[PDB]
Structures are given as C-alpha cells and as structure tokens.
PDB file of C-alpha atoms in Angstrom:
ATOM      1  CA  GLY O   1      -1.725  -8.143   1.684  1.00  0.00           C
ATOM      2  CA  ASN O   2       0.706  -5.434   2.867  1.00  0.00           C
ATOM      3  CA  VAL O   3       1.200  -6.151   6.703  1.00  0.00           C
ATOM      4  CA  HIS O   4       3.934  -8.697   7.200  1.00  0.00           C
ATOM      5  CA  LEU O   5       3.991 -10.847  10.348  1.00  0.00           C
ATOM      6  CA  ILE O   6       7.388 -11.445  11.737  1.00  0.00           C
ATOM      7  CA  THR O   7       7.979 -14.690  13.659  1.00  0.00           C
ATOM      8  CA  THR O   8      11.701 -15.194  13.009  1.00  0.00           C
ATOM      9  CA  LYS O   9      14.926 -13.249  13.429  1.00  0.00           C
ATOM     10  CA  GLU O  10      15.735 -14.302   9.839  1.00  0.00           C
ATOM     11  CA  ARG O  11      12.421 -12.886   8.476  1.00  0.00           C
ATOM     12  CA  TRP O  12      13.024  -9.585  10.358  1.00  0.00           C
ATOM     13  CA  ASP O  13      16.570  -9.464   8.929  1.00  0.00           C
ATOM     14  CA  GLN O  14      15.240 -10.158   5.432  1.00  0.00           C
ATOM     15  CA  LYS O  15      12.463  -7.493   5.481  1.00  0.00           C
ATOM     16  CA  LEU O  16      14.758  -4.803   6.904  1.00  0.00           C
ATOM     17  CA  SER O  17      17.172  -5.693   3.955  1.00  0.00           C
ATOM     18  CA  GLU O  18      14.386  -5.344   1.386  1.00  0.00           C
ATOM     19  CA  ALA O  19      13.212  -2.043   2.766  1.00  0.00           C
ATOM     20  CA  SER O  20      16.833  -0.707   2.756  1.00  0.00           C
ATOM     21  CA  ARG O  21      17.187  -2.134  -0.858  1.00  0.00           C
ATOM     22  CA  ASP O  22      14.132   0.000  -1.803  1.00  0.00           C
ATOM     23  CA  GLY O  23      14.686   3.033   0.413  1.00  0.00           C
ATOM     24  CA  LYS O  24      11.494   2.282   2.405  1.00  0.00           C
ATOM     25  CA  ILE O  25      10.999   3.298   6.050  1.00  0.00           C
ATOM     26  CA  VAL O  26       9.881   0.227   8.138  1.00  0.00           C
ATOM     27  CA  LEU O  27       7.000   0.666  10.488  1.00  0.00           C
ATOM     28  CA  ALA O  28       7.432  -2.081  13.119  1.00  0.00           C
ATOM     29  CA  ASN O  29       4.399  -2.873  15.375  1.00  0.00           C
ATOM     30  CA  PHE O  30       5.631  -4.933  18.286  1.00  0.00           C
ATOM     31  CA  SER O  31       2.462  -6.452  19.531  1.00  0.00           C
ATOM     32  CA  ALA O  32       0.789  -9.470  21.100  1.00  0.00           C
ATOM     33  CA  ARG O  33      -2.135 -11.815  20.042  1.00  0.00           C
ATOM     34  CA  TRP O  34      -4.041 -11.719  23.291  1.00  0.00           C
ATOM     35  CA  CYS O  35      -3.660  -8.006  23.668  1.00  0.00           C
ATOM     36  CA  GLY O  36      -6.633  -5.790  23.804  1.00  0.00           C
ATOM     37  CA  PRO O  37      -5.280  -2.470  22.620  1.00  0.00           C
ATOM     38  CA  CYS O  38      -3.374  -4.419  19.901  1.00  0.00           C
ATOM     39  CA  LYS O  39      -6.604  -6.022  18.600  1.00  0.00           C
ATOM     40  CA  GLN O  40      -8.216  -2.623  18.775  1.00  0.00           C
ATOM     41  CA  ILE O  41      -5.732  -1.097  16.190  1.00  0.00           C
ATOM     42  CA  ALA O  42      -4.995  -4.185  14.131  1.00  0.00           C
ATOM     43  CA  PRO O  43      -7.644  -3.470  11.345  1.00  0.00           C
ATOM     44  CA  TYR O  44      -6.603   0.231  11.287  1.00  0.00           C
ATOM     45  CA  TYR O  45      -2.972  -0.918  10.762  1.00  0.00           C
ATOM     46  CA  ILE O  46      -3.968  -3.087   7.815  1.00  0.00           C
ATOM     47  CA  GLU O  47      -5.977  -0.183   6.364  1.00  0.00           C
ATOM     48  CA  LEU O  48      -2.909   2.120   6.821  1.00  0.00           C
ATOM     49  CA  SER O  49      -0.731  -0.389   5.112  1.00  0.00           C
ATOM     50  CA  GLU O  50      -2.979  -0.280   1.980  1.00  0.00           C
ATOM     51  CA  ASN O  51      -2.799   3.516   1.934  1.00  0.00           C
ATOM     52  CA  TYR O  52       0.967   3.966   2.316  1.00  0.00           C
ATOM     53  CA  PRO O  53       2.957   1.752  -0.059  1.00  0.00           C
ATOM     54  CA  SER O  54       6.243   3.624   0.636  1.00  0.00           C
ATOM     55  CA  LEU O  55       6.301   2.319   4.292  1.00  0.00           C
ATOM     56  CA  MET O  56       6.937  -1.339   4.877  1.00  0.00           C
ATOM     57  CA  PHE O  57       4.380  -2.363   7.610  1.00  0.00           C
ATOM     58  CA  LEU O  58       5.585  -5.119   9.957  1.00  0.00           C
ATOM     59  CA  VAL O  59       3.929  -6.730  13.008  1.00  0.00           C
ATOM     60  CA  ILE O  60       6.346  -8.358  15.459  1.00  0.00           C
ATOM     61  CA  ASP O  61       4.762 -11.041  17.545  1.00  0.00           C
ATOM     62  CA  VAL O  62       6.405 -10.345  20.924  1.00  0.00           C
ATOM     63  CA  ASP O  63       5.286 -13.708  22.545  1.00  0.00           C
ATOM     64  CA  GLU O  64       7.085 -15.522  19.719  1.00  0.00           C
ATOM     65  CA  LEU O  65      10.232 -13.208  19.396  1.00  0.00           C
ATOM     66  CA  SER O  66      10.627 -12.712  23.238  1.00  0.00           C
ATOM     67  CA  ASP O  67      14.421 -12.293  23.298  1.00  0.00           C
ATOM     68  CA  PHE O  68      14.461 -10.063  20.185  1.00  0.00           C
ATOM     69  CA  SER O  69      11.781  -7.939  21.887  1.00  0.00           C
ATOM     70  CA  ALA O  70      13.744  -7.577  25.172  1.00  0.00           C
ATOM     71  CA  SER O  71      16.536  -6.435  22.959  1.00  0.00           C
ATOM     72  CA  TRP O  72      14.269  -3.639  21.585  1.00  0.00           C
ATOM     73  CA  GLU O  73      13.311  -3.046  25.199  1.00  0.00           C
ATOM     74  CA  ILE O  74       9.635  -3.554  24.634  1.00  0.00           C
ATOM     75  CA  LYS O  75       7.861  -2.430  27.889  1.00  0.00           C
ATOM     76  CA  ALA O  76       4.247  -2.332  26.634  1.00  0.00           C
ATOM     77  CA  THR O  77       2.134  -3.509  23.707  1.00  0.00           C
ATOM     78  CA  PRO O  78       1.630  -2.340  21.062  1.00  0.00           C
ATOM     79  CA  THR O  79       4.875  -0.493  20.538  1.00  0.00           C
ATOM     80  CA  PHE O  80       5.599   1.184  17.122  1.00  0.00           C
ATOM     81  CA  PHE O  81       9.034   2.104  15.723  1.00  0.00           C
ATOM     82  CA  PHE O  82       9.732   3.903  12.476  1.00  0.00           C
ATOM     83  CA  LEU O  83      12.972   2.700  11.206  1.00  0.00           C
ATOM     84  CA  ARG O  84      15.249   3.950   8.393  1.00  0.00           C
ATOM     85  CA  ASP O  85      18.102   1.641   7.801  1.00  0.00           C
ATOM     86  CA  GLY O  86      17.512   0.468  11.315  1.00  0.00           C
ATOM     87  CA  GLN O  87      17.770   3.803  13.079  1.00  0.00           C
ATOM     88  CA  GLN O  88      14.796   4.982  14.864  1.00  0.00           C
ATOM     89  CA  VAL O  89      13.201   7.959  13.356  1.00  0.00           C
ATOM     90  CA  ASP O  90      10.247   7.774  15.638  1.00  0.00           C
ATOM     91  CA  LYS O  91       8.329   5.731  18.119  1.00  0.00           C
ATOM     92  CA  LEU O  92       4.844   5.491  19.492  1.00  0.00           C
ATOM     93  CA  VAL O  93       3.853   3.503  22.521  1.00  0.00           C
ATOM     94  CA  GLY O  94       0.200   2.483  22.516  1.00  0.00           C
ATOM     95  CA  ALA O  95      -2.740   2.033  20.108  1.00  0.00           C
ATOM     96  CA  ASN O  96      -3.127   5.727  19.594  1.00  0.00           C
ATOM     97  CA  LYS O  97      -4.822   5.908  16.059  1.00  0.00           C
ATOM     98  CA  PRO O  98      -4.571   9.757  15.485  1.00  0.00           C
ATOM     99  CA  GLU O  99      -0.999   9.926  16.726  1.00  0.00           C
ATOM    100  CA  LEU O 100       0.149   6.969  14.598  1.00  0.00           C
ATOM    101  CA  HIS O 101      -1.431   8.466  11.499  1.00  0.00           C
ATOM    102  CA  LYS O 102       0.164  11.869  12.282  1.00  0.00           C
ATOM    103  CA  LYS O 103       3.617  10.265  12.620  1.00  0.00           C
ATOM    104  CA  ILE O 104       3.185   8.400   9.379  1.00  0.00           C
ATOM    105  CA  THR O 105       2.116  11.748   7.689  1.00  0.00           C
ATOM    106  CA  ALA O 106       5.183  13.624   9.071  1.00  0.00           C
ATOM    107  CA  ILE O 107       7.777  10.951   8.124  1.00  0.00           C
ATOM    108  CA  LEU O 108       6.232  10.626   4.722  1.00  0.00           C
ATOM    109  CA  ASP O 109       6.525  14.315   3.403  1.00  0.00           C
ATOM    110  CA  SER O 110       9.938  15.061   4.841  1.00  0.00           C
ATOM    111  CA  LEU O 111      12.352  12.043   5.013  1.00  0.00           C
TER     112      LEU O 111
END
C-alpha cells in the first residue's frame, strides 16, 4: 500500500521528512478526485509505486490542500514533481504514462 494520500500540511511535512531521513526522492502527484486524466493514470501510479520502492509516491489532493497547491503554482491536474530534499529535480504536467515512466527511469539510475 505504497501511494500515500496527502490531505494535511502536517502529513506532507512528515512524509518529506521521512523521505529525506531515508534518502528517497518524493514523487508528488498533485491531482483531483473528479478529474478525468487523473483517474485515467491513478491505477498506473499505484502499479508504479509497487515497482519502485526507492521513490516515495505521494498524491496531493488539490481540492483539499487548495492554498498549499497555489503555493506550488498548480495550473493543471495531474501535476507531478520529483523532489529531492524539496528541490525539484523534475516535473511532468499531465497524465502522460510513457513520459512519467521515462522520468522515473532517468532519476532512478543517476541521482
């Protein structure tokens, strides 16, 4: 059960601490419940999370964390950030399955 749903600024702040603790890169999926391209990739994202234990997979519910989201300047859903210690290593706007998988692949070998 490797995708964590973030609903609170405290739970975000906790999970980022854990990943830092363990030298994991955080994949954050800023997405929405009633969002069609977000539903489209949601099972793929769970499947990815099973296959890549050295990434911490988060989903950020943008309807719930609306202020935190404006702060990350979310302009479309889903939006993905790869974060190391909070610094963006990469970013993907949209449910693009191939592209997401390629970014995970690239961040994994090298960083």
